[PDB]
């Protein structure tokens, strides 16, 4: 059960983006924006699409389990959008979901980057960890 816990903050106190990779109950990977870099830019681009003033917090749960991919997202601690594997688009019902989904599909291949990440590169690395650990 490989899992990525991604977070982003519009207003960080002087880490706008930091990731925590997990294999089940154990954390193996940690990423910070100061020191996935393509999703760091994908997450910080999401706040430019929201049109609101107040500070936002974007979270992500990208991972796979033996293969099932979860692509859930939360805006301000509320799940607002999902990744649809068939259409290959981030999908929600809230206006913020569509706004961020559209800002992310402007990148013109970020949808395919996400779909390959969930379909092949997460299961591959999960099984590679299963073998090497």
């Amino acid at each position: 059960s490989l899992l990525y816990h991604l977070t982003a903050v519009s207003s960080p106190a002087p880490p706008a983006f930091w990731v925590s990779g997990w294999l089940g109950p154990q954390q193996y990977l940690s990423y910070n924006s100061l020191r996935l870099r393509i999703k760091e830019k994908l997450f910080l681009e999401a706040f430019k699409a929201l049109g609101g003033k107040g500070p936002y917090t974007l979270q992500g749960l990208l991972g796979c389990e033996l293969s099932v991919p979860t692509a859930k997202f939360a805006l301000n601690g509320e799940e607002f959008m999902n990744f649809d594997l068939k259409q290959g688009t981030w999908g929600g019902d809230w206006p913020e979901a569509l706004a961020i989904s559209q800002r992310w599909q402007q990148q013109d291949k970020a949808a395919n980057k996400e779909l390959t990440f969930l379909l092949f590169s997460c299961p591959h690395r999960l099984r590679e960890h299963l073998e090497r650990g």
């Binding site: 977070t7 903050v9 106190a13 925590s20 997990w22 500070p55 917090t57 601690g77 799940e79």
Partner: peptide, 28 residues
């Protein structure tokens, strides 16, 4: 939302007070 940072620092929101649970609530 906003959450109460239950201390046993976990199950809170927002982040400023690191990973989160299925609750989308952060903890340290």
């Amino acid at each position: 939302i906003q959450r109460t940072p239950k201390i046993q620092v976990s199950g809170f929101h927002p982040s400023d007070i690191l990973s989160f649970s299925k609750d989308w609530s952060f903890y340290l």
